[PDB]
Design a protein around this ligand. Structure first.
Ligand SMILES: CCCCCCC/C=C\CCCCCC(=O)OC[C@H](O)CO
Ligand SMILES: CCCCCCC/C=C\CCCCCC(=O)OC[C@H](O)CO
Ligand SMILES: CCCCCCC/C=C\CCCCCC(=O)OC[C@H](O)CO
Ligand SMILES: CCCCCCC/C=C\CCCCCC(=O)OC[C@H](O)CO
Ligand SMILES: CCCCCCC/C=C\CCCCCC(=O)OC[C@H](O)CO
Ligand SMILES: CCCCCCC/C=C\CCCCCC(=O)OC[C@H](O)CO
Ligand SMILES: CCCCCCC/C=C\CCCCCC(=O)OC[C@H](O)CO
Ligand SMILES: CCCCCCC/C=C\CCCCCC(=O)OC[C@H](O)CO
Lengths: 99, 115, 93
């Protein structure tokens, strides 16, 4: 494990971690708490999987092939949909908690 | 600092566009997800239920995209009748199906409790 | 016997969730968390299969790919445990 040192995983991971702490402190019921923690962790999961795929693509080599770009782009799109899912989740659950 | 964000956005859009342009099944899937999201958005349910209905179909989309990413790596290598090519695609597909079955079931449970 | 024990795990979990006297939402969360663990494991296995398809010779990016995949699985597992602890604490509170 030497990937944890890279600035990008640092940023993404710290965002997720912060969100998990804040969710741990909030005055919400249990199901809401679980939803808030899960959406963000799913963003972490997806980013890790995406990076795994990027690592394989790069393992194959430097010469560009359309399917390499495609694999990376599809990975990114997955990450994007997860992020949007996290944002919808927090917005819907906390608009309710807006007081 | 936020150029990572713009770069990543652009890759992501290229990815959605590729998936959509290349397969009718992907387009029809995307329609089903958009319809589910809209329906979830207008339904008279509580907030958690709305989120479950949304997250389940979103998850379908996320896994469909990751699995397609993997298919593209396989096809990149050659797919020349290999044991692990087969295996890789088989595992990816199992994943997709699990997501879909879970979404369907989640919707049926939640809408049974609702109506 | 490394892929079956997981089906055992999920069947057990499902049995517990059914057995527990919880409402539909809670049940959906309990089973979903477990299900995500399976999906992520299957995708990790897919990556591993490709990595080995390329070559069994070591290469830093191969190790990197497997490490990232395994970390995904770990995060899903942690998320499952957090979900179960939370929902069950709530149910028994
Ligand atoms: C008070 C918080 C309100 C918002 C809660 C939901 C936030 C949802 C997701 C946060 C995860 C973002 C991780 C950072 C990220 O994706 O960075 C992009 C990369 O650096 C691009 O390479
Ligand atoms: C800028 C566009 C995107 C904004 C983020 C996504 C929007 C998602 C949810 C909006 C909040 C839900 C509606 C407001 C709300 O909760 O009203 C109170 C209850 O509905 C009353 O039962
Ligand atoms: C609140 C947002 C919910 C989003 C749910 C997931 C949607 C997933 C996939 C839809 C992708 C749409 C891409 C459309 C596309 O590529 O169009 C290209 C056209 O051919 C030219 O513009
Ligand atoms: C009255 C109940 C149903 C309400 C339906 C509301 C809208 C639902 C789905 C909209 C899907 C529209 C297409 C989105 C999309 O990806 O378009 C692709 C581009 O137009 C490129 O051709
Ligand atoms: C324009 C809807 C489709 C695109 C966005 C989908 C994700 C964002 C929001 C959907 C959930 C928020 C809608 C408003 C809402 O929840 O209202 C609740 C009402 O109190 C009862 O319906
Ligand atoms: C109760 C629905 C909630 C779950 C939605 C899961 C969506 C997953 C996959 C969509 C399946 C494909 C949509 C139908 C389709 O392709 O129709 C095409 C025509 O039948 C033939 O061209
Ligand atoms: C293949 C993915 C999905 C796997 C789960 C399939 C369905 C299994 C279990 C879900 C719950 C079914 C039983 C419902 C239940 O226990 O109801 C409670 C009773 O009414 C007693 O209160
Ligand atoms: C060494 C780690 C110890 C904790 C691991 C399991 C804890 C899981 C999630 C942390 C959530 C903390 C917020 C408070 C909390 O759980 O409240 C429960 C709700 O009040 C409903 O029971």
């Amino acid at each position: 494990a030497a990937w944890i040192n890279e600035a990008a995983f640092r940023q993404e991971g710290v965002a997720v971690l912060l969100c998990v702490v804040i969710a741990a402190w909030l005055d919400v019921d249990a199901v809401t708490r679980v939803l808030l923690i899960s959406s963000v962790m799913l963003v972490m999961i997806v980013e890790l999987l995406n990076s795994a795929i990027e690592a394989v693509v790069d393992r194959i080599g430097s010469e560009y092939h359309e399917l390499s770009g495609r694999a990376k782009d599809l990975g990114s799109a997955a990450v994007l949909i997860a992020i949007i899912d996290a944002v919808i989740t927090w917005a819907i659950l906390l608009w309710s908690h807006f007081g």
